[PDB]
Design a protein around this motif. Sequence first.
Motif, PDB file in Angstrom:
ATOM      1  N   UNK A   1      11.044   3.536  -6.333  1.00  0.00           N
ATOM      2  CA  UNK A   1      10.094   3.207  -7.388  1.00  0.00           C
ATOM      3  C   UNK A   1       8.766   3.864  -7.126  1.00  0.00           C
ATOM      4  N   UNK A   2       7.752   3.435  -7.871  1.00  0.00           N
ATOM      5  CA  UNK A   2       6.374   3.861  -7.642  1.00  0.00           C
ATOM      6  C   UNK A   2       5.496   2.623  -7.741  1.00  0.00           C
ATOM      7  N   UNK A   3       5.092   2.088  -6.590  1.00  0.00           N
ATOM      8  CA  UNK A   3       4.378   0.821  -6.535  1.00  0.00           C
ATOM      9  C   UNK A   3       2.871   0.958  -6.689  1.00  0.00           C
ATOM     10  N   UNK A   4       2.309   2.143  -6.468  1.00  0.00           N
ATOM     11  CA  UNK A   4       0.878   2.326  -6.648  1.00  0.00           C
ATOM     12  C   UNK A   4       0.485   1.885  -8.051  1.00  0.00           C
ATOM     13  N   UNK A   5      -0.640   1.187  -8.152  1.00  0.00           N
ATOM     14  CA  UNK A   5      -1.115   0.634  -9.406  1.00  0.00           C
ATOM     15  C   UNK A   5      -2.629   0.518  -9.327  1.00  0.00           C
ATOM     16  N   UNK A   6      -3.275   0.429 -10.483  1.00  0.00           N
ATOM     17  CA  UNK A   6      -4.724   0.313 -10.564  1.00  0.00           C
ATOM     18  C   UNK A   6      -5.058  -1.042 -11.172  1.00  0.00           C
ATOM     19  N   UNK A   7      -5.764  -1.871 -10.409  1.00  0.00           N
ATOM     20  CA  UNK A   7      -6.162  -3.208 -10.839  1.00  0.00           C
ATOM     21  C   UNK A   7      -7.682  -3.254 -10.820  1.00  0.00           C
ATOM     22  N   UNK A   8      -8.285  -3.445 -11.993  1.00  0.00           N
ATOM     23  CA  UNK A   8      -9.740  -3.493 -12.121  1.00  0.00           C
ATOM     24  C   UNK A   8     -10.375  -2.228 -11.556  1.00  0.00           C
ATOM     25  N   UNK A   9      -9.662  -1.110 -11.685  1.00  0.00           N
ATOM     26  CA  UNK A   9     -10.132   0.167 -11.197  1.00  0.00           C
ATOM     27  C   UNK A   9      -9.876   0.435  -9.731  1.00  0.00           C
TER      28      UNK A   9
ATOM     29  N   UNK B   1      -1.152  -1.489  -4.517  1.00  0.00           N
ATOM     30  CA  UNK B   1       0.238  -1.315  -4.895  1.00  0.00           C
ATOM     31  C   UNK B   1       0.969  -2.625  -4.676  1.00  0.00           C
ATOM     32  N   UNK B   2       1.686  -3.054  -5.705  1.00  0.00           N
ATOM     33  CA  UNK B   2       2.313  -4.364  -5.753  1.00  0.00           C
ATOM     34  C   UNK B   2       3.818  -4.164  -5.771  1.00  0.00           C
ATOM     35  N   UNK B   3       4.532  -5.023  -5.060  1.00  0.00           N
ATOM     36  CA  UNK B   3       5.975  -4.930  -4.940  1.00  0.00           C
ATOM     37  C   UNK B   3       6.633  -6.098  -5.649  1.00  0.00           C
ATOM     38  N   UNK B   4       7.858  -5.866  -6.109  1.00  0.00           N
ATOM     39  CA  UNK B   4       8.605  -6.835  -6.896  1.00  0.00           C
ATOM     40  C   UNK B   4       9.992  -6.994  -6.274  1.00  0.00           C
TER      41      UNK B   4
ATOM     42  N   UNK C   1      -4.180 -11.830  -5.356  1.00  0.00           N
ATOM     43  CA  UNK C   1      -3.771 -11.413  -4.022  1.00  0.00           C
ATOM     44  C   UNK C   1      -2.909 -10.156  -4.060  1.00  0.00           C
ATOM     45  N   UNK C   2      -3.349  -9.144  -4.798  1.00  0.00           N
ATOM     46  CA  UNK C   2      -2.735  -7.831  -4.712  1.00  0.00           C
ATOM     47  C   UNK C   2      -3.302  -7.073  -3.520  1.00  0.00           C
ATOM     48  N   UNK C   3      -2.434  -6.351  -2.820  1.00  0.00           N
ATOM     49  CA  UNK C   3      -2.855  -5.620  -1.630  1.00  0.00           C
ATOM     50  C   UNK C   3      -3.676  -4.420  -2.090  1.00  0.00           C
ATOM     51  N   UNK C   4      -5.000  -4.562  -2.060  1.00  0.00           N
ATOM     52  CA  UNK C   4      -5.918  -3.571  -2.596  1.00  0.00           C
ATOM     53  C   UNK C   4      -6.898  -3.139  -1.519  1.00  0.00           C
TER      54      UNK C   4
ATOM     55  N   UNK D   1       4.505   1.778   1.041  1.00  0.00           N
ATOM     56  CA  UNK D   1       5.746   1.100   1.387  1.00  0.00           C
ATOM     57  C   UNK D   1       5.616   0.303   2.677  1.00  0.00           C
ATOM     58  N   UNK D   2       4.712   0.708   3.576  1.00  0.00           N
ATOM     59  CA  UNK D   2       4.521  -0.009   4.832  1.00  0.00           C
ATOM     60  C   UNK D   2       4.044  -1.434   4.624  1.00  0.00           C
ATOM     61  N   UNK D   3       3.341  -1.709   3.528  1.00  0.00           N
ATOM     62  CA  UNK D   3       2.910  -3.061   3.201  1.00  0.00           C
ATOM     63  C   UNK D   3       4.053  -3.919   2.689  1.00  0.00           C
ATOM     64  N   UNK D   4       5.173  -3.304   2.306  1.00  0.00           N
ATOM     65  CA  UNK D   4       6.193  -4.025   1.558  1.00  0.00           C
ATOM     66  C   UNK D   4       6.574  -5.318   2.253  1.00  0.00           C
ATOM     67  N   UNK D   5       6.906  -5.246   3.540  1.00  0.00           N
ATOM     68  CA  UNK D   5       7.255  -6.459   4.260  1.00  0.00           C
ATOM     69  C   UNK D   5       6.111  -7.461   4.262  1.00  0.00           C
ATOM     70  N   UNK D   6       4.917  -7.044   4.696  1.00  0.00           N
ATOM     71  CA  UNK D   6       3.842  -8.014   4.866  1.00  0.00           C
ATOM     72  C   UNK D   6       3.567  -8.713   3.543  1.00  0.00           C
TER      73      UNK D   6
END
Length: 290
Positions: free
Chosen positions: A1-9, A13-16, A170-173, A257-262
Amino acid sequence: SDHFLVINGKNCCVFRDENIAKVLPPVLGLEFVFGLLGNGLALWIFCSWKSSRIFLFNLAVADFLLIICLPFLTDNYVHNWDWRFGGIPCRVMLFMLAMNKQGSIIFLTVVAVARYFRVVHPHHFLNKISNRTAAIISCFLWGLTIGLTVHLLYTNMMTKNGEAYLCSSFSICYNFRWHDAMFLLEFFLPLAIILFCSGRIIWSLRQRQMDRHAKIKRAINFIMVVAIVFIICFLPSVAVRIRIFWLLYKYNVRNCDIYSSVDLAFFTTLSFTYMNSMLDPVVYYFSSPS
Ligand SMILES: C1c2c(-c3nnn[nH]3)n[nH]c2[C@@H]2C[C@H]12
């Protein structure tokens, strides 16, 4: 996939992961039902006469408010991070979660400090405060909580993730903001207060042995139970978030992707912070001889 995303600028990257939709509702449903069946009673009957009853009533109110909004979290999870209600609703839902958790922690600390004054300073005047001052203190503390957490209603939290709609504070930003500092403090400062108050209360009690240990032991056990319950409930998520901040500082969000687990870990530990609200009636109210 492509998890990178822009939240409030900001580049997050958020995982599902479907494991979140599979495991969390199992814990959240139990938390909701137990929180209802405990705190609704703790509110129906206070735990109004004494200041301590007032503070415990406020704690129960905060716990009730926090649990009644857990079904919406369960909905967000079963649909794998798909909010179906729109922006203003989840603005409000996240605001409620944050404000009610903060209020519950504040009132735990207030009860702990009141016990400390009651056992260590028997003839302080705090032990003879009238209900009016308890009400004013409680109102001011509630006002502090809202003043701290109203920025959630102020700001935007709804963002379109591909084919879905994700709502989350709580998005990893790569953005350390006041919400995270508050999240850490709500554990570190009241934990220090609670542990100190308890240690002084248990130290003061152990200096007097006038043939009534049967119930003083019980009180010491309950103080320790409160402390350990707080720690086990709230420390895990803070620890995971501190790992998250170390990662963000060293490995910025590019290969995220390294954040995926945490990330998964974090949202499996937030559940514990809600579970406190279903334990609190047993720790504080139902332990009394009623
Ligand atoms: C729970 C939660 C919270 C929260 N804050 N306080 N308790 N839960 N913020 N953001 C999010 C996403 C949907 C999960």
